[PDB]
């Protein structure tokens, strides 16, 4: 399963126009994670006006 996933997504990359694209240059996401943010810097918080 790991090998299959890797070979399926290996060339998907964040481009300099900030879009996420595969090797064919097709657009997979207009911004990474729908927000264009890297996963190391984000963290858990609470929306104070929701509940």
């Amino acid at each position: 399963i790991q090998r299959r996933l890797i070979k399926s997504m290996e060339s998907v990359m964040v481009k300099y126009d900030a879009t996420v694209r595969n090797s064919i240059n097709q657009v997979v996401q207009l911004r990474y994670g729908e927000d264009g943010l890297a996963g190391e810097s984000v963290e858990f918080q609470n929306l104070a006006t929701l509940k």
Binding site: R4, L5, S8, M9, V12, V20, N22, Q26, V27, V28, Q29, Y32, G33, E34, D35, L37, G39, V42, K51
Partner: protein, 101 residues
């Protein structure tokens, strides 16, 4: 609360209504949705192929994200949503269900 009916009371609070729900052993989402007194808005399935055939590519994108999240988080784990989103976009960006095979 993930299967309860979460409404917003008139006072503005989230309230979890304790309601009856049915779990089937087979899937006819096409037929079950079109039944009297059955909710055609929240009734779903875990068979992503039927979701694709009945609701479409974005519906199966969302449902596939939900099912992968359920598989990952059932053991209490947590994975950043952008990874699930990227996997699910890879499987659905070409208009059909692209298996990882």
């Amino acid at each position: 609360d993930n299967k309860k009916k979460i409404i917003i009371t008139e006072d503005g609070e989230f309230k979890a209504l304790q309601e009856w729900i049915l779990e089937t052993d087979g899937v006819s989402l096409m037929r079950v949705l079109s039944e009297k007194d059955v909710d055609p808005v929240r009734t779903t399935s875990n068979d992503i192929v039927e979701i694709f055939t009945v609701l479409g590519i974005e519906a199966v994108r969302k449902a596939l994200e939900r099912e992968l999240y359920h598989v990952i988080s059932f053991d209490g784990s947590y994975v950043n949503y952008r990874h699930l989103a990227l996997l699910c976009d890879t499987m659905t960006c070409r208009g059909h269900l692209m298996a990882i095979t």
